[PDB]
């Protein structure tokens, strides 16, 4: 799943 902490947005 999208890594919110790294990407900042999902």
């Amino acid at each position, epitope marked *: *799943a*999208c*890594n*919110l*902490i*790294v990407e900042g*947005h*999902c």
Partner: antibody
Framework: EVQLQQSGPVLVKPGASVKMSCKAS????????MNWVKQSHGKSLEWIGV????????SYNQKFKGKATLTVDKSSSTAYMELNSLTSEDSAVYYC??????????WGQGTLITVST | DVLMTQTPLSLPVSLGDQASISCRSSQSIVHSNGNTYLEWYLQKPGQSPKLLIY???NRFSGVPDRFSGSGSGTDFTLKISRVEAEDLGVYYCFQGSHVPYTFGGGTKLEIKR
């Protein structure tokens, strides 16, 4: 001077729900993601999910999908976790833990949930 | 999920000794952006966990330099030099590179006397 103060321990019945809080002080609440972590007695730590207080975005460990719901109230600088459909397996200490580039740089003191009749 | 395997489960160490804790991941912890989000925590009896090391080898503010983190890819090590009695507790490795984030099972540091 960062402090995360979690709400007090709670005894709740199987099948019920419970909502616990994590009150942030000493920094700008919206600046950093807030994580939640479960620790069952004598067991390892488990990551439940993360919320961005800036905009309410969330990301969950699928193990806790439909078990845990993360929210924030920006005006009160408080993060919340609500657990539903409680079973004995949900008896644990629950921590909020704040991001700082690192994942869990500051931890609350934990909230002890006991699920029992 | 990425599995984090710590060894040993229990680590007895004398005051002033060096303790070494191993953490191996089931797949590389190097993120596509090049960072390795491998961290080490200590949970002392009755307390919340506390951050010691982030991004493999970086000490959090206030952590003394006798704690050192090393390794890369799938194999990581925490070395605690000049062990003090107050170092006892359970040490955890942790990866944030892959969702869901996962913890190692813990290593209980015991003081020999």
């Amino acid at each position: 001077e960062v402090q995360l103060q979690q709400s007090g321990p709670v005894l709740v019945k199987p099948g019920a729900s419970v909502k616990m809080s994590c009150k942030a002080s000493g920094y700008t609440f919206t600046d950093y993601y807030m994580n939640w972590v479960k620790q069952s007695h004598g067991k390892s730590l488990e990551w439940i999910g993360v919320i961005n207080p800036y905009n309410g975005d969330t990301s969950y460990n699928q193990k806790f999908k439909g078990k845990a719901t993360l929210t924030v109230d920006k005006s009160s600088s408080t993060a919340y976790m609500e657990l539903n459909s409680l079973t004995s397996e949900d008896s644990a200490v629950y921590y909020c833990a704040r991001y700082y580039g690192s994942w869990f740089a500051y931890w609350g003191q934990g909230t002890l949930i006991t699920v029992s009749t | 999920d990425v599995l984090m395997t710590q060894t040993p489960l229990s680590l007895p160490v004398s005051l002033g000794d060096q303790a070494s804790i191993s953490c191996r991941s089931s797949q590389s912890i190097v993120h596509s952006n090049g960072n390795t989000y491998l961290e080490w925590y200590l949970q002392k009896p009755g307390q919340s966990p506390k951050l010691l090391i982030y991004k493999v080898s970086n000490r959090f503010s206030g952590v003394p330099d006798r704690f050192s983190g090393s390794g890369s890819g799938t194999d990581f090590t925490l070395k605690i030099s000049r062990v003090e009695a107050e170092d006892l507790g359970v040490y955890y490795c942790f990866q944030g590179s892959h969702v869901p984030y996962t913890f190692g099972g813990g290593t209980k540091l015991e003081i020999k006397r």
